[PDB]
Design an enzyme around this catalytic site. Structure first.
Site, mmCIF file in Angstrom:
data_model
loop_
_atom_site.group_PDB
_atom_site.id
_atom_site.type_symbol
_atom_site.label_atom_id
_atom_site.label_comp_id
_atom_site.label_asym_id
_atom_site.label_seq_id
_atom_site.Cartn_x
_atom_site.Cartn_y
_atom_site.Cartn_z
ATOM 1 N N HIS A 41 0.836 -1.219 0.000
ATOM 2 C CA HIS A 41 0.000 0.000 0.000
ATOM 3 C C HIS A 41 0.872 1.272 0.000
ATOM 4 O O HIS A 41 0.298 2.352 -0.138
ATOM 5 C CB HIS A 41 -1.096 -0.003 1.071
ATOM 6 C CG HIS A 41 -0.665 0.115 2.491
ATOM 7 N ND1 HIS A 41 0.101 1.173 2.947
ATOM 8 C CD2 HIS A 41 -0.971 -0.637 3.570
ATOM 9 C CE1 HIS A 41 0.260 1.043 4.263
ATOM 10 N NE2 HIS A 41 -0.409 -0.044 4.681
ATOM 11 N N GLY A 143 2.172 6.385 9.467
ATOM 12 C CA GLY A 143 3.605 6.345 9.154
ATOM 13 C C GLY A 143 4.284 5.137 9.768
ATOM 14 O O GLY A 143 5.452 4.900 9.442
ATOM 15 N N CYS A 145 3.481 1.891 9.344
ATOM 16 C CA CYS A 145 3.376 0.688 8.499
ATOM 17 C C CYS A 145 4.786 0.251 8.103
ATOM 18 O O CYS A 145 5.685 1.120 7.883
ATOM 19 C CB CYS A 145 2.440 0.895 7.317
ATOM 20 S SG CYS A 145 0.734 1.284 7.822
HETATM 21 C C1 35J Z 1 0.698 3.013 7.638
HETATM 22 S S1 35J Z 1 1.946 3.989 7.135
HETATM 23 N N1 35J Z 1 -0.571 3.556 7.688
HETATM 24 C C2 35J Z 1 -1.772 2.833 8.223
HETATM 25 C C3 35J Z 1 -1.884 2.881 9.736
HETATM 26 C C4 35J Z 1 -2.282 4.023 10.398
HETATM 27 C C5 35J Z 1 -2.355 4.048 11.775
HETATM 28 C C6 35J Z 1 -1.975 2.923 12.458
HETATM 29 N N2 35J Z 1 -1.640 1.754 11.859
HETATM 30 C C7 35J Z 1 -1.555 1.781 10.514
#
Ligand code: 35J
Ligand code: 35J
Ligand code: NA
Ligand code: NA
Ligand code: NA
Ligand code: NA
Ligand code: NA
Ligand code: NA
Lengths: 305, 305
Positions: A41, A143, A145
């Site tokens: 993603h 941020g 991920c």
């Molecule tokens: C990842 S960079 N973004 C999705 C997310 C947002 C908040 C917590 N866990 C994943």
């Protein structure tokens, strides 16, 4: 003496964290040998996340569109491929800090450490369990991920988790390092609900053993039970059924303490039926289920890495 | 979303841990620049620990009696001195992994991460608070002495704790990195009892703010209070008195949430008087006091190192 929710030392994994940017999206990657692993993603706009076609979105991407930075320093991307829900970015430099490692797919009830990262940099380390509904209860912001979950055996890191998603209920979903989600979750911004979050019974029992080894003994009672009788009570309190496999794994703790597993089950049955009456066990007012039997032996014997 | 008891990433400290052996006693040392810091009780036999004269015991010790090993590799000891309750062993090699660092003496209520080590090797990392009675509630076995507690600010490690002692009640005592004990404790195997372990009120309030930021809001009530009225209740429940200094430190969390500090105090007063009625806050059945206001801001904003 004392018993704490303890994470593995994070240094071996700290040396593998990088930043990955595609277009306006920045998240974390794991750099092992000459491959960087990250959530697919990374390629999605905010429009895209609502209903993404990953194969179609990836056609518009070339090696030079994936910006990979290891500390202050840019890596050169010489290939990319999609495996399930992760991208594999081939770089021209092997990570010099690559530890011995394996990719493992864990079972529900297994624990691991998370190195929560932002912009390729570590924020903090904590211990998690894979819940029976295949979510985890983490601490993750936008941020985060590509942050990973791992176990260590002496000098070998077993990576078991990469963070992808927050559900609307604020619990967490992600993949193994082959990109297969734990549970039925998908990498799309659509309402996904988790199933019943049951308690990991074998882990509660392990923690009650840890409590006895540390002198917290008030909950030990005069009773025993059978697997079938205990399991009727487990089912009523949304506890996982106990199997003979679980009884076998608790054998070393049973041998160390002299408390038969089914005797400890009868102590747990009474705590479920009676509650704690305002008392604590190992400084907790709830029955703790994120220590495995292996975790309790490791902590109580001072195993190092 | 989510809120976890999070330790600092441990890699910078992992690179500083060594093994120190004097005679038959092995424990941990901290190698910074060309000095190794360790508990002075490394020089004691089991007889000695009952009533040691450290100056007299140290007369019988030379540089070559202190065996220092960094991984597989022996360091050469070219000097030694005692500073309060620590030994400083001067070695002929500067640690190549020495991070930017400082020695700090913390206040009661301040939190830090512990890297629990055995034989110079890391076992695990967890978060602690300096209790108001100057003990810590750790997880430490024989051989864990010289393990350290620390905080990080970006790339600079602040060492605040070195582990020396378990009290008969299974709580932990140790020193700053100048060798001065926290509290009245001494490095002798004699019965020492801790004073009242009061709750760190300013930290509970910070954690209630963390709970609101994460959607756990059931405990917010219709009331306010005053510092003097709240403090009468704090005293009755063995909570530390709240000062205007504490109110000032909670200002940013008050501003973020729109909940006046004295309003949150009135919510806390009701939880003390009424209990939780079998409910949880951020997955805890007790009021948690080992997050500082700084810790809550850091975790809720994703600060990295
Ligand atoms: C990842 S960079 N973004 C999705 C997310 C947002 C908040 C917590 N866990 C994943
Ligand atoms: C340090 S090597 N020995 C004392 C001790 C023992 C158990 C726990 N904490 C400290
Ligand atoms: Na990570
Ligand atoms: Na998942
Ligand atoms: Na457990
Ligand atoms: Na340490
Ligand atoms: Na102390
Ligand atoms: Na707290």
């Amino acid at each position: 003496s004392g018993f704490r929710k303890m994470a593995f030392p994070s240094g071996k994994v700290e040396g593998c964290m990088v930043q990955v940017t595609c277009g306006t999206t920045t998240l974390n990657g794991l750099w092992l040998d000459d491959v960087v692993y990250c959530p697919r993603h990374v390629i999605c706009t905010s429009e895209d996340m609502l209903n993404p076609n990953y194969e179609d979105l990836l056609i518009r991407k070339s090696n030079h569109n994936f910006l990979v930075q290891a500390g202050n320093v840019q890596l050169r991307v010489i290939g990319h491929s999609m495996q399930n829900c992760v991208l594999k970015l081939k770089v021209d430099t092997a990570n010099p800090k690559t530890p011995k490692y394996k990719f493992v797919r864990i079972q529900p009830g297994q624990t691991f450490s998370v190195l929560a990262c932002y912009n390729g940099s570590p924020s903090g380390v904590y211990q998690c369990a894979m819940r029976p509904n295949f979510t985890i209860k983490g601490s993750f912001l936008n941020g985060s991920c590509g942050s990973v979950g791992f176990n260590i055996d002496y000098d070998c890191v077993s990576f078991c988790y990469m963070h992808h998603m927050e559900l609307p209920t604020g619990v967490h979903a992600g993949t193994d390092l082959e990109g297969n989600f734990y549970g039925p979750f998908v990498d799309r911004q659509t309402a996904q609900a988790a199933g019943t979050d049951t308690t990991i019974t074998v882990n509660v029992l392990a923690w009650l053993y840890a409590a006895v080894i540390n002198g917290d003994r008030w909950f030990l009672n005069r009773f025993t039970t059978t697997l079938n009788d205990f399991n009727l009570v487990a089912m009523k309190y949304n506890y996982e059924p106990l199997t003979q496999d679980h009884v076998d794994i608790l054998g070393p703790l049973s041998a160390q303490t002299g408390i038969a597993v089914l005797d400890m089950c009868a102590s747990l049955k009474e705590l479920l039926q009676n509650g704690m009456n305002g008392r604590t066990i190992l400084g907790s007012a709830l029955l703790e289920d994120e220590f495995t039997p292996f975790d309790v032996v490791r902590q109580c014997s001072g195993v190092t890495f």
